[PDB]
Every structure is written in C-alpha cells, then in structure tokens.
C-alpha cells in the first residue's frame, strides 16, 4: 500500500489565482516591485547627484512591495497544503 507516502506538493504556482483577491494582490504588488526597483536604480545610478531622501522613500515602498509578494507566495503554499490535506485524507480510502 501507500505506507507513509503523502501527496506530492505542487511545483510552480499555476493555482489558487481563482481567488480574485490573490491575483489582484499579486499584480498590484508585482507592479510596485517593478516601479520601486526602477525608481531606486534611476535615483542611484542614472543621476548626477543622489537624493538620499528620495532613495529612502523608494526603499520603503520597495520593501513593502517585495514583502506583499512574499505574503502572497506563502498564502499559496498554505492553500496548497490545506488542499493536499484533503487529498491525503481522501486517499486513505485506497487502502
């Protein structure tokens, strides 16, 4: 029988974006990562004099967007394991 094996966890994240909130969150946060990465790079490497307050501002918005993306990624992993819990429970009828 299956013994101590359990359902294998999913590879990439082609799932649970049926949640409209998660996909809205991903795309707003990803766009803001793109936005603040650009603005930080421009304000440190494409200007003659670095305006340090500008850089700090966009560093705050950058870390905010990166961590929003992280929190979506962790929520997707939690949702997948919650679903794998039910799959694993259903699979106990195969014995």
């Amino acid at each position: 029988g299956r013994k101590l094996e359990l359902t294998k966890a999913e590879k990439h994240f082609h799932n649970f974006m049926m949640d409209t909130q998660l996909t809205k969150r991903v795309k707003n946060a990803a766009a803001n990562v793109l936005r603040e990465t650009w603005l930080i790079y421009k304000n440190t490497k494409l200007v003659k004099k670095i305006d340090h307050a500008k850089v700090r501002k966009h560093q705050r918005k950058f870390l905010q967007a990166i961590h929003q993306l992280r929190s979506v990624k962790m929520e997707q992993r939690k949702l997948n394991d919650q679903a794998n819990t039910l799959v694993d429970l259903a699979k106990t009828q195969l014995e």
């Binding site: 299956r2 013994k3 966890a9 909130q21 039910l86 799959v87």
Partner: protein, 146 residues
C-alpha cells in the same frame, strides 16, 4: 492524471468523510468542520478558495464530479522520510542525532495521543537497533520507511 475505476468507487467512500449531511455537495461549513477535526484552522476565505479551485459550475459547493476530478490531478505521492526525521529531531535536545530510550518513552507516554508503556516497549525494541539505550532516529526512520 487518469483514474482507475477501482479508485472511483474508492473516492465515493471518501466523499462521505466530507459531505457531513449526505447532501451530495460539500460546502465551506462542512469543509471547515472536517479541516478543524484534522487539527487545522483555515479561514473562511481559505475555505472558499479551496472550493473555488474545484467548483466547475460555480454554484459555490463541490459535487462528487468536481471532487473526483480534482483527485485525478494530485495522485502523485512522495516519501515522507525527511519530514518524519524532522519530527524526531524536535526531541533531539542536544542536536546530536540521538534520543535516549528513556527520553523517547517519556515523550511517547506523555505527549500527543500517547502510547501505553507496553506499546512503547515494542517501539523501543525496534528503535534501539544497537541495544545501547540510544535511538539513532535517522536509522530508525530509514528502517520504517523502507
């Protein structure tokens, strides 16, 4: 991702572990009841998301057709050797890869659902491979997952 007919009758029995009222559909309230009986605490949104990734027709509940279809995409299993080793490591106070037999008896007779002292005797007899009063839990876990 193609189900044997054997397994179809199997998952119908599984469906009743979930359809707490024989409704023919699984709702979020039943899914929450089941999830909580397995020691988990999903939020209302997490339950709706679980249903929503399976609900083909979009009526907010899971029928046996959508239940049975979603099993077909997750039949692949993998071994749990490393996860079980990590559960043992929880009790490896010195992080030296050993748990004493006395300590394993203390854990198994006091934490979780527990075992009887007789049950623990058989477990330690298997677990203490070298008869030295110490459990090399990676080796013991490897023996049980063989």
């Amino acid at each position: 991702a193609a189900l044997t007919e054997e397994q179809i009758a199997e998952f119908k029995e599984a469906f009743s572990l979930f359809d707490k009222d024989g409704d023919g559909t699984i709702t979020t309230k039943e899914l929450g009841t089941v999830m909580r009986s397995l020691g988990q605490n999903p939020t209302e949104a997490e339950l709706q998301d679980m249903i929503n990734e399976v609900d083909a027709d979009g009526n907010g509940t899971i029928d046996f057709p959508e239940f049975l279809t979603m099993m077909a995409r997750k039949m692949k299993d993998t071994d749990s050797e490393e996860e079980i080793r990590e559960a043992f490591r929880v009790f490896d106070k010195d992080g030296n890869g050993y748990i004493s037999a006395a300590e394993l008896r203390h854990v198994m007779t006091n934490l979780g659902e527990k075992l009887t002292d007789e049950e623990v005797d058989e477990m330690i007899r298997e677990a203490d491979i070298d008869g030295d009063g110490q459990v090399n839990y990676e080796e013991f876990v490897q023996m049980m997952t063989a």
